[PDB]
Each structure stands twice: as structure tokens, then as C-alpha cells.
């Protein structure tokens, strides 16, 4: 029989990532991989196996192209004709954290286990964080060469 | 590019300081600062010339070389001597005058028109029909020139409005 995680065999860890001048797509993909926990060999899809990840400086996200004005973030409130339109520039001007939150929630699984993984992502705008008590390990995204 | 190959002369009574990519100009008429594009570099020739260099022969370098050279030349020449633009107020019942730093224009409107003068620009009136503006930055001088010119809509029939020294507006008449 293959291995599956037990009740308390699951382990967590705290990682902090700076987002200054980092590409949104790469940063968010790496974060999603970390929250799902594909970095541990004890991965199992029916139970959460990832780590808590904290991102700093959500307002310093850098994106390529002219999408600062030509990319839109959409949502509809519920009434007919209630569709409203905002850009990434306005989104970072108003709530900088929303863009990173949306990007990460878009690639996590869209099931209840996925939104349960979403429960454990901390996203802030400023350079400080009140979670220094949990001594997070700084994480820098790297690529394996082959 | 072609102009950029020609170095910008530096007059003796002008002090130039460079620190990396930021550049500043010191002169009798004041100080001004600008930042140049990253891929290209600028150097100070020992014989009193400004040398701007592009790393490659690609589009951005080729375009920005001449831009940087001409911008620096304009900056240094404006800082040493300066810039004047004069206007003519032609029409009937058109009155212009200056109080303090502000300018008041009687352009036929039922209400008086007041414009607030930005920093680093000067105004001087010679006649109620024509005045001049003096300044150091071509940007601000042109900004003020355009702002003043856009008070009045174009008038191709009677020449009513405001215009520069040599500006010509075509004449046309209707029989009806």
C-alpha cells in the first residue's frame, strides 16, 4: 500500500518572500506551488501539505508590457447592468494587495480544499509584518538547471 | 544620432556636475536637473564638450542618442543666456495687464480671466497690446505659451485672439 499522510504527521513552516521588482506571474506561480506543497515528497492531493507563505511589498509588483493601462480586473456585483471596470493601475493605487490575492487564488484549486489552502496565505503591502514572532525563513525563488 | 555624433560645447561660465545617470547644470540663471535613459551613457570631454554615447546600433539607442544630446544642449544654453517668447494681443476691446505675479486678461468675457504664474517663470508687459514671457526652461515657457494661446478659439475671419510673433492665420471671408 502507498503512503498517505496521517492526522498529525502533517508539518507546517513559515516562509516570507519579498516582492520588490518581481514578475507577478512567476511570483504567484511559485507561491501557489509552495502553498500546495509540491516541494515536499509527502504530497497528497486530498489533504493540505503546503506551508504558510507571507509576501511583502505587494505594491512593488512589476509586470511587463503595457498592461498597466490595458489590463482590466473584472467583477459583477449581482444586479443586471451592474458590471464594473477597473485597471491594474487603479487596483494598486486603491488596494495593492488585491492583485496578488486574486492572482494566487486564480491558480490554487477552485474546490473547497483549494480555498482551504487559500486560508493560509498572508499578503501585506508594507515592508513590515506583525508575524515576526513565528521566525519565518526568507525564501528566494530559484530555478534548477539541467 | 547624426547630431549626437557632434559633441555639445560647454561655455566657460557654466558648471556641470554628473553623478552616475543623474545630471545637473549650474549657471548664472539658475540650476536644472534631468535624468537620461538607462542604456546610453554620457561623458564629459576634457576640452569642454559633452559626449553622449550609445552602446548598440539598435532602435532605442539610435533614437535616444540625439534626444539626449539636444536636450543637454538646450539645457546648457538656456541656463547660460535664457529664453523669451513674446505675444501680440490683436482685436478690439482686448486688454492685458500684469499685477504682482499674476496676469489679468480682458478678452471680451463677461468675467475677468486670471492665470497663476508657475515657479521659475517671469512675465513683463510692454504695451496693452503685446507682452513677453521670460524664463529658463523650454518646457515651462512652452507650457505657458500654449496655456495662454488656448484661451481663445481660432478666428480665421477677423484675427481675433492671441498669437505669437510670426504666427500666421489664413484669411477667409464669406459673402453672406
Amino acid at each position: 500500500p502507498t503512503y498517505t499522510p496521517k492526522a498529525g504527521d502533517t508539518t507546517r513552516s513559515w516562509y516570507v518572500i519579498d516582492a520588490s521588482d518581481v514578475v507577478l506571474g512567476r511570483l504567484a506561480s511559485a507561491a501557489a506551488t509552495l502553498l500546495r506543497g509540491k516541494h515536499k515528497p509527502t504530497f497528497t492531493p486530498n489533504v493540505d501539505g503546503g506551508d504558510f507563505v507571507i509576501v511583502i511589498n505587494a505594491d512593488k509588483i512589476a509586470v511587463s508590457g503595457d498592461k498597466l493601462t490595458k489590463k482590466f480586473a473584472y467583477r459583477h456585483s449581482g444586479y443586471p447592468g451592474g458590471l464594473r471596470k477597473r485597471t491594474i493601475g487603479e487596483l494598486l493605487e486603491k488596494h495593492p494587495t488585491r492583485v496578488v490575492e486574486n492572482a494566487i487564488i486564480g491558480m490554487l484549486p477552485h474546490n473547497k480544499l483549494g480555498r482551504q489552502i487559500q486560508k493560509k496565505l498572508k499578503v501585506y503591502a508594507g515592508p513590515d509584518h506583525p508575524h515576526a514572532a513565528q521566525q519565518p525563513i526568507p525564501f528566494e525563488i530559484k530555478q534548477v538547471a539541467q | 544620432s547624426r547630431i549626437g555624433k557632434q559633441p555639445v560645447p560647454v561655455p566657460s561660465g557654466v558648471d556641470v556636475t554628473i553623478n552616475g545617470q543623474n545630471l545637473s547644470v549650474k549657471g548664472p540663471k539658475g540650476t536644472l536637473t534631468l535624468d537620461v535613459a538607462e542604456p546610453i551613457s554620457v561623458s564629459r570631454a576634457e576640452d569642454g564638450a559633452i559626449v553622449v554615447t550609445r552602446p548598440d546600433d539598435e532602435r532605442r539607442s539610435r533614437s535616444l542618442h540625439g534626444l539626449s544630446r539636444t536636450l543637454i544642449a538646450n539645457l546648457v544654453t538656456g541656463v547660460t543666456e535664457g529664453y523669451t517668447q513674446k505675444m501680440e494681443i490683436f482685436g478690439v476691446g482686448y486688454r492685458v495687464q500684469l499685477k504682482g505675479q499674476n496676469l489679468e486678461f480682458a478678452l471680451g468675457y463677461s468675467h475677468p480671466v486670471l492665470i497663476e504664474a508657475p515657479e521659475g517663470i517671469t512675465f513683463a508687459v510692454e504695451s496693452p497690446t503685446k507682452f513677453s514671457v521670460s524664463g529658463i526652461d523650454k518646457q515651462k515657457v512652452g507650457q505657458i505659451s500654449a496655456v495662454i494661446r488656448r484661451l481663445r478659439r481660432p478666428d480665421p475671419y477677423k484675427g481675433k485672439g492671441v498669437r505669437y510673433e510670426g504666427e500666421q492665420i489664413r484669411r477667409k471671408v464669406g459673402k453672406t
Binding site: 502507498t2 503512503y3 509540491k38 516541494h39 515528497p41 509527502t42 534548477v144 539541467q146 | -
Partner: protein, 60 residues
């Protein structure tokens, strides 16, 4: 793939090197080892990189 990336190698490179070395162990046993003995994976990845050729983009 998780274990390989922890040991700093990709899944495709690990499998290709394993096939070149001629080890016939199957993914069941590799997964149980990944759960079990990182020493076993350390030896295995060392063997895989040893069996890996000089240049991966050679026309050969």
C-alpha cells in the same frame, strides 16, 4: 518530481539518467523511498548524474 526537485534535479532528467544507468526500479518503490530514505534518493540522484552524458544538446 517533488523528491527530485528537493534533490536539485528535474523529473525528466532523473528518469533519463536512471534509464541510462539501467536501473529497473519502478515508481512505486521510488515513491515509497521518497517517503522513506532520502539517503536512498541521495545515492540514486548521484548515480543518475554520474550516468548523465556530457552535453544534453548533442546531436547524438
Amino acid at each position: 518530481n517533488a523528491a527530485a526537485r528537493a534533490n536539485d534535479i528535474t523529473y525528466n532528467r532523473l528518469i533519463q539518467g536512471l534509464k541510462a544507468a539501467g536501473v529497473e526500479v519502478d515508481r512505486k518503490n521510488l515513491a515509497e523511498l521518497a517517503v522513506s530514505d532520502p539517503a536512498a534518493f541521495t545515492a540514486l540522484v548521484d548515480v543518475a548524474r554520474a550516468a548523465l552524458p556530457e552535453d544534453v544538446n548533442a546531436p547524438s
